[PDB]
Design a protein around this ligand. Structure first.
Ligand code: 56I
Ligand code: OXL
Length: 780
């Protein structure tokens, strides 16, 4: 029983008083509002908000039974009696409180009939999580396959088919009930922590995500090397074995940017060494030489680190002395029994813990470490009586990984202000992307079911801020012998998802270079393709940094007025132009692809398909997975390199998928030095744009470059433009007004500047793309 009492304004912030206390409403933007209940009282701070203390001028109108607090896009309508806030985009009702807040923390809201609800982060439950209830408590799900209610990286957030996102801005042990218990109620609970939610609206799923990342944080562009090939296993046992793996990528002619060292780098056993955070010199005798030798070959070294310091580790006494570990209520170091032994947890919420841990990361980075892997940040074990500087384990649990990332990100920026941090972690919070967190889906089983779940997990995380969500390619957990077909399908899919990191327990090889001749003959040209496609992938990365647009986009983006598409977790967009359908079972001979209506091409075979809605049936082979290209796509390639350290776009090859159904099309290629964290902010980039105009008698391309450029940027790029499905009726090409005849023979066999291959329906134009605008005009 709750009712309006009064309200004031304070720094664009509405402070409402009910019978039961204060509520602070602040627009963080024109489409996003923070609703803090118990505003009078001391709470944990926001974790989700990039700018917690921000609030923008909103307009306030008081009526008889209601208030209205509007930002521009988003309207909070505050019914006085009974007390209930609802939320409008213009006058479209998004979300209405039921009971709203009840004081354990509780929030209740109505669900509309037929409303579909994505969210919760990593679960394997179906894309629409409506009808589900699950905890908000980051926890391991070792060896998961085709089902999970609770894994490494939950998010206290949802995305509705009404096109809002709701965030429960609370770090504590909790639960989400999505109209499970009560068909028409969504309920958020926590045992403790901040009593705050955040509503974000958009006109579309893309502008919703732009709105969400605006207020929760934009991922800084990762180093281009994060888009390369990783050598990883659990785990390289020695310097010799690590050097032998880098050598195996060289002798097997697979691309390699980064080798990842698991927990044997700091001790000879799985158990009893964690917290050493220093080289096991018996097995890694010359690590500085090792990292420098790798850097000469363009290969980066990434080291695993964990929150736990064992009482058996060389750093126990020092960590206790420095007060770096979390404490019991008595005030001693909290020790508890992990798989690895008895130990404590570094308190990343404390000054002493942050400085102690930071200092260790600084020393190892100085020795030559390029990037960082933080495993077990759930935290994996976190007894309820553990005491952090700001709260107990159950209150801070879901933000530990978040703050660990922040700590490590700040540290890397202060040591190397001219480099982009690489921070790979298993657990974080809403907004962790702003600290460059790159998550993976943990200890997935080596099963088809484990593979079949990855698109669902990736889209669920991508939709709520995590563009670089990926899987251990090939699978991680148990098995006794390689499932070759599964492995191949997993590393094919890998090419078309964010981070190319095969990884698994080392009783079965995870790295493609250790596979049989057939497997290498299939995967080698696909790992090269990943590198040739860097201009496509790096451009999707750039768009992610700009707008939060995830690299993997769900099928439902193709038609926002067809909510039935929301259920799809078998087909997704890799950037704007590729519809990928991974094969997730053995012996599949053909697939039915629910391609949006329009024209589509087989990425592998150039075959043209049109559909008015009917799905497309494509046969399958072991060599590839089904990928369709959207008519109007510009697919840019550079020559394959072994390492992104050698990346050049002096030679470009661009494939344009022509069809009269697409009279207007645009592409862009974002180029910078691949390393400068300030490139976008300072416009130290080369942004190539291509526009196609396709009419009955003409096909016109406009090429341009913006940005201030960057050191080593090519002035002039040798460009091969390959036009797929080109009309056989074009006779003349103008290039900036200069007329060139189109050859109709021997295109593959002459240094032709314009040649039509009649057999392939491909028109090839070869030219110089310099800094000035270029127009190419084909006419019948
Ligand atoms: C953490 C992580 O999920 C996995 O990739 C890693 O190889 C191991 C060992 O460091 C960790 N999982 S654990 O074996 O369950 O500890
Ligand atoms: O697309 C065209 O213009 C054609 O097919 O000739």
């Amino acid at each position: 029983a709750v009712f309006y009492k009064e309200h004031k304004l304070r720094n664009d912030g509405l402070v409402i008083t009910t019978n039961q206390g204060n509520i602070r409403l602040q627009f963080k933007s024109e489409a996003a509002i923070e609703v803090l209940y118990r505003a009078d009282s001391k709470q944990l701070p926001s974790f989700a908000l990039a700018q917690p203390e921000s609030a923008i001028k909103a307009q306030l109108t008081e009526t008889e039974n209601h208030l209205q607090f509007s930002g521009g896009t988003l309207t909070a309508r505050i019914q006085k009696r009974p007390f209930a806030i609802s939320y409008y985009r213009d006058s479209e009702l998004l979300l209405a409180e039921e009971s709203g807040f009840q004081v354990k923390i509780n929030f209740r809201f109505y669900l509309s009939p037929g409303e579909k609800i994505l969210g919760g982060g990593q679960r394997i439950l179906g894309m629409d999580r409506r009808g589900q209830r699950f905890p908000l408590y980051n926890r391991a799900h070792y060896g998961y396959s085709d089902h999970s209610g609770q894994m490494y990286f939950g998010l206290p957030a949802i995305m509705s088919s009404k096109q809002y996102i709701l965030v429960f801005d609370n770090s504590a042990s909790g639960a989400m009930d999505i109209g499970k218990t009560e068909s028409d109620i969504l309920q958020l609970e926590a045992k403790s922590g901040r009593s705050a939610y955040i509503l974000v609206a958009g006109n579309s799923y893309p502008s919703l995500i732009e709105n969400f990342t605006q207020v929760t944080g934009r991922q800084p562009l990762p180093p281009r090397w994060a888009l390369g090939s990783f050598a990883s296993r659990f785990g390289y046992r020695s310097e010799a074995e690590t050097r032998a793996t880098v050598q195996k990528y060289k002798t097997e002619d697979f691309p390699l940017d980064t080798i990842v060292l698991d927990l044997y780098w700091f001790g000879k056993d799985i158990k009893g060494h964690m917290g050493n955070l220093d080289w096991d010199k018996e097995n890694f005798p010359t690590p500085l030489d090792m990292m420098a030798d790798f850097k000469q070959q363009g290969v980066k070294t990434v080291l695993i680190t964990e929150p736990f310091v064992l009482t058996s580790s060389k750093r126990w006494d020092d960590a206790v002395k420095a007060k770096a570990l979390a404490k019991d209520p008595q005030g001693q170091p909290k020790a508890f029994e992990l798989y690895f032994g008895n130990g404590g947890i570094i308190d990343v919420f404390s000054k002493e813990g942050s400085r102690w841990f930071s200092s260790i990361y600084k020393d190892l980075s100085k020795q030559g470490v390029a990037g960082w892997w933080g495993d077990l940040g759930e935290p994996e074990m976190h007894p309820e009586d553990t005491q952090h500087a700001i709260g107990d384990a159950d209150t801070v649990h879901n933000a530990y990984g978040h703050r660990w990332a922040e700590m490590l990100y700040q540290q890397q920026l202060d040591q190397f202000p001219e480099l982009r941090p690489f921070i790979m972690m298993r657990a974080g919070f809403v907004g962790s992307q702003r600290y460059g967190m790159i998550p993976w889906t943990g200890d997935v089983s080596r099963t088809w079911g484990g593979l079949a779940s990855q698109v669902e997990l990736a889209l669920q995380m991508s939709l709520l801020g995590f563009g670089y969500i990926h899987s251990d390619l090939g699978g991680f957990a148990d098995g006794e012998t390689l499932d070759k077909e599964m492995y191949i399908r997993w590393l094919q899919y890998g090419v078309f998802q964010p981070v190319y990191r095969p990884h698994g327990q080392d009783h079965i090889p995870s790295e493609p270079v250790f596979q049989d001749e057939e497997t290498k003959a299939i995967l080698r040209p696909l790992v090269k393709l990943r590198y040739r496609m860097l201009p496509y992938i790096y451009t999707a990365a750039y768009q992610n940094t700009l707008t939060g647009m995830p690299l993997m986009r769900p099928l439902f983006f193709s038609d926002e007025k067809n909510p039935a598409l929301i259920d799809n977790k078998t087909s997704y967009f890799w950037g704007d132009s590729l519809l990928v359908t991974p094969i997730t079972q053995a012996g599949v001979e053909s697939v039915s692809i629910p391609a949006p209506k329009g024209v589509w091409f087989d990425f592998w075979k150039d075959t043209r398909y049109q559909t008015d809605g009917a799905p497309l049936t494509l046969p399958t082979d072991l060599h590839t997975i089904p990928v369709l290209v959207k008519a109007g796509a510009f697919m840019p390639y550079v020559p394959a390199v072994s390492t992104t350290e050698d990346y050049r776009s002096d030679s470009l090859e661009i494939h344009y998928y022509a069809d009269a159904s697409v009279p207007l099309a645009q592409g862009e290629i974002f180029e910078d030095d691949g390393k400068d964290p300030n490139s976008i902010k300072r416009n130290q980039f080369d942004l190539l744009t291509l526009q196609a105009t396709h009419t009955d008698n003409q096909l016109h391309f406009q090429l341009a470059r913006t940005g201030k450029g960057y050191r080593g940027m090519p002035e002039r790029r040798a460009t091969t433009l390959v036009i797929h499905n080109a009309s056989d009726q074009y006779q003349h090409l103008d290039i900036n007004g200069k007329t060139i005849a189109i050859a109709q023979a021997d295109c593959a066999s002459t240094p032709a500047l314009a040649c039509y291959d009649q057999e392939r329906r491909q028109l090839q134009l070869v030219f110089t793309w310099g800094r000035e605008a270029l127009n190419l005009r084909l006419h019948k």
